[PDB]
Amino acid sequence: MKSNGCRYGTHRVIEPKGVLPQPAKILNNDMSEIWDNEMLIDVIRLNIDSASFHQIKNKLIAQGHQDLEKAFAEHAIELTNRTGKHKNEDTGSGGMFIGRVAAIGDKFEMKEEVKVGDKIASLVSLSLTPLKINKVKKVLLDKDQMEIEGQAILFSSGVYAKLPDDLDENLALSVLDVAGAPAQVERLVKPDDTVVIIGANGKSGILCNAVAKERAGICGKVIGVVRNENYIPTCKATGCDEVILAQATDAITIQKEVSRLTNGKMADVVINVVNTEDTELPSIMAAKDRGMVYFFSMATSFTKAALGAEGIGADVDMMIGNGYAHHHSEIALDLLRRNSVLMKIFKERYAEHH
Amino acid sequence: MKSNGCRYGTHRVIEPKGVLPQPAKILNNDMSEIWDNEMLIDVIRLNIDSASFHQIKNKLIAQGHQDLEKAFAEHAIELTNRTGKHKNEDTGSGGMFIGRVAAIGDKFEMKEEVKVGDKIASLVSLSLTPLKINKVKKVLLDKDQMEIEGQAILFSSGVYAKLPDDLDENLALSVLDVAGAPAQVERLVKPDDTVVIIGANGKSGILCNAVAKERAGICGKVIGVVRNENYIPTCKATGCDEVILAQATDAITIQKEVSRLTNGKMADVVINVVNTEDTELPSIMAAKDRGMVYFFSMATSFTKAALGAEGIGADVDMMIGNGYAHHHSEIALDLLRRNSVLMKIFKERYA
Ligand SMILES: NC(=O)c1ccc[n+]([C@@H]2O[C@H](COP(=O)([O-])OP(=O)(O)OC[C@H]3O[C@@H](n4cnc5c(N)ncnc54)[C@H](OP(=O)(O)O)[C@@H]3O)[C@@H](O)[C@H]2O)c1
Numbered sequence A: 001m002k003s004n005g006c007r008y009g010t011h012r013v014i015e016p017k018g019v020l021p022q023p024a025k026i027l028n029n030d031m032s033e034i035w036d037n038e039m040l041i042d043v044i045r046l047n048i049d050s051a052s053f054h055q056i057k058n059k060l061i062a063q064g065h066q067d068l069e070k071a072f073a074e075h076a077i078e079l080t081n082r083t084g085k086h087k088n089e090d091t092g093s094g095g096m097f098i099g100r101v102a103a104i105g106d107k108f109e110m111k112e113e114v115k116v117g118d119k120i121a122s123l124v125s126l127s128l129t130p131l132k133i134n135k136v137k138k139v140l141l142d143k144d145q146m147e148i149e150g151q152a153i154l155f156s157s158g159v160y161a162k163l164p165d166d167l168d169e170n171l172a173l174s175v176l177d178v179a180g181a182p183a184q185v186e187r188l189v190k191p192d193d194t195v196v197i198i199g200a201n202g203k204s205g206i207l208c209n210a211v212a213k214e215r216a217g218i219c220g221k222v223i224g225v226v227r228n229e230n231y232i233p234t235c236k237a238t239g240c241d242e243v244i245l246a247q248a249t250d251a252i253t254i255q256k257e258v259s260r261l262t263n264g265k266m267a268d269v270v271i272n273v274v275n276t277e278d279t280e281l282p283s284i285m286a287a288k289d290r291g292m293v294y295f296f297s298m299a300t301s302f303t304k305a306a307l308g309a310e311g312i313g314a315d316v317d318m319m320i321g322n323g324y325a326h327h328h329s330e331i332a333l334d335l336l337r338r339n340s341v342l343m344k345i346f347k348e349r350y351a352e353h354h
Numbered sequence B: 001m002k003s004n005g006c007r008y009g010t011h012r013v014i015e016p017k018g019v020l021p022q023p024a025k026i027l028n029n030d031m032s033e034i035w036d037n038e039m040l041i042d043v044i045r046l047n048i049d050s051a052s053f054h055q056i057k058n059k060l061i062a063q064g065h066q067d068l069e070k071a072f073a074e075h076a077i078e079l080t081n082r083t084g085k086h087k088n089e090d091t092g093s094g095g096m097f098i099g100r101v102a103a104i105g106d107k108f109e110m111k112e113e114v115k116v117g118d119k120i121a122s123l124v125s126l127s128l129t130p131l132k133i134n135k136v137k138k139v140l141l142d143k144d145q146m147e148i149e150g151q152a153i154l155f156s157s158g159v160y161a162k163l164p165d166d167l168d169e170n171l172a173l174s175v176l177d178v179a180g181a182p183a184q185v186e187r188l189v190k191p192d193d194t195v196v197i198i199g200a201n202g203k204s205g206i207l208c209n210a211v212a213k214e215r216a217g218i219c220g221k222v223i224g225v226v227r228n229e230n231y232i233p234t235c236k237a238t239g240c241d242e243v244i245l246a247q248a249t250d251a252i253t254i255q256k257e258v259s260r261l262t263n264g265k266m267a268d269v270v271i272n273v274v275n276t277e278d279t280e281l282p283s284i285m286a287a288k289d290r291g292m293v294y295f296f297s298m299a300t301s302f303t304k305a306a307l308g309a310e311g312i313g314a315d316v317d318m319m320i321g322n323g324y325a326h327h328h329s330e331i332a333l334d335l336l337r338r339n340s341v342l343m344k345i346f347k348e349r350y351a
């Protein structure tokens, strides 16, 4: 056991010196000894970022490989052996892993309480994760997955979650993927608030509907925005009092309908969980004066949000949605255990085994 | 005077119907009658977005013009007459205007109090502003400016500022340019807070230093981050208690130095006012747990900030720096009037 490990993991950065593990080019993936504030994982499965997986697959096709599973497996071993991690060298994307705890340093900053042998999922990207792949058992070309024998390091600053014994693994992973959204909504929504959820039928959207309605309470108002009439029942069953039919890019219709439904008062909190571009101004205009607009979509443009609010004189607070929050996995999993409607929808949509 | 004008201005959108004035292709710039919630301006000068001005200049050269001032003037007349606004048709960029209030609709949402004749600057883009150019008097090729006779519409949702007749106009416009930064900093900093200002020697930075120190007070702590030791006296004179020398992209140095100056407690509030990319993670790591990180720079990447905080388990709030806030002009100008050190620096730097 090595001493004086950096919680941010800089002790494993080989190239270039003086940067963090994520932007680094080469990490130390020597698993024979760990630092005192690290956690070592026996990796079972690698869930590669879909864009990275597709980009690597197509690069290999273009180079002329016929056996794609074998070419991909060999690509992953070469990449991880040389750079210490599975960070896509063209996109910068990573992924996450599933495995069982192998060793815990005595100064590891424990978050969720876990012990050797526990089954866990990482909630930080493979783009900063020291990873040693000893064997690729299977490349699942259609699932962006590799079943492997290997090991990974979590730094004390990293994030992980114990996978619950009583839940379908893919169901649990689906909640963990978006756990930050309901966690943040719980912090934002006051009793009696009006809340507008843009993209309310989505995976994070239906979780946001439910905690928004729990937090806003009996005299609050939760308004979902969807573009498909097919989604109205689900939005209402998961917490929406009202549903607006609009493209999330249609600022005028959303403003008009939110105004109708609130008698001009508009929303205290706007939660944006769409996966498309140019929805910043429609979200801003749904808010009341000094309201809160929480942008979760990775499609959000900083400049479009900033210039959007300036051009129409909207004095609103606009937050970059932080996917991490203390206890967010436990909070999101507890939401599904309290709400049988959500649990049934999540199992139907995202459970592997039915 | 027509009634039931939309505060967002959709009643002047001709093409395509169903979008807002800024994304619209064609606006109605008929100034003979205004709507009840509009304000009509006699425009003196058009400050064209510099990139837009340069793109139009070069387009005209390539078409074969030679007398650029005259071709540019004719370009602006054709563009505004046809589309109703000076929105650059290739880039989408606009600009702002300076003018005198001509008429005030009876239902205009008054922000700062102005009456007919007041000298004002628009603080919203020419790309959403109905604009009629009756004459171009002078095209200033080195200044991205046109002196004109014409009129413009401010919607009730628009933003403007009265230009005080007692201050140099370039100085006033420079303050208006960054007024949202001190205004927003005033709301975030509590007494006894530790505040880190990244880019503390810049135009917005020195205003943020001063506001951070008055709000954090005698037992608060204001830390500037700059990369030049020559900037230290200015940072301290405008409010910093301590100054860190680091590149704003150097997350490890900034984290270590903020930790040193705060005994590991880190910053309650981080203000990022640099004009450089890849400073998100350094800003996040300067904050304490559940601290507030305010990104003012237009170089801020949404995904870099979100994924940055996620990867190191930083439960911090990250705010998109708005740039507009109620009364921001008045608040920033009052800061200069109350703080002789800032006024003197702003005078020397920004004419
Ligand atoms: N940082 C984090 O950890 C974090 C946390 C939560 C969310 N997020 C982000 O939030 C976004 C949503 O993620 P998710 O997993 O919830 O995705 P999802 O399940 O695909 O949900 C997206 C929803 O938005 C709707 N939508 C997209 N574009 C639309 C438009 N133009 N008009 C109307 N509706 C539209 C979709 O419905 P249609 O069927 O109509 O397309 C869908 O219901 C992603 O960008 C994700 O990265 C990130």
Ligand SMILES: NC(=O)c1ccc[n+]([C@@H]2O[C@H](COP(=O)([O-])OP(=O)(O)OC[C@H]3O[C@@H](n4cnc5c(N)ncnc54)[C@H](OP(=O)(O)O)[C@@H]3O)[C@@H](O)[C@H]2O)c1
Binding pocket: A306, B177, B178, B179, B180, B181, B198, B199, B200, B201, B202, B203, B204, B205, B225, B226, B227, B228, B246, B247, B248, B249, B272, B273, B274, B275, B276, B296, B297, B298, B299, B321, B322, B323, B324
């Ligand atoms: N409209 C809005 O929403 C709004 C409002 C307020 C601020 N802002 C934004 O804030 C940014 C700054 O505005 P400004 O007018 O204050 O600009 P400015 O006067 O040029 O200030 C930028 C400051 O940052 C420093 N800096 C830049 N890169 C650095 C690096 N890598 N390391 C250390 N220091 C660095 C510069 O110092 P050096 O001399 O060392 O380069 C300079 O002092 C702009 O992007 C602006 O758009 C926008």
Ligand SMILES: [Cl-]
Binding pocket: B029, B030, B031, B032, B132
């Ligand atoms: Cl006219």
Ligand SMILES: [Cl-]
Binding pocket: A300, A301, A302, A303, B300, B301, B302, B303
């Ligand atoms: Cl962005």
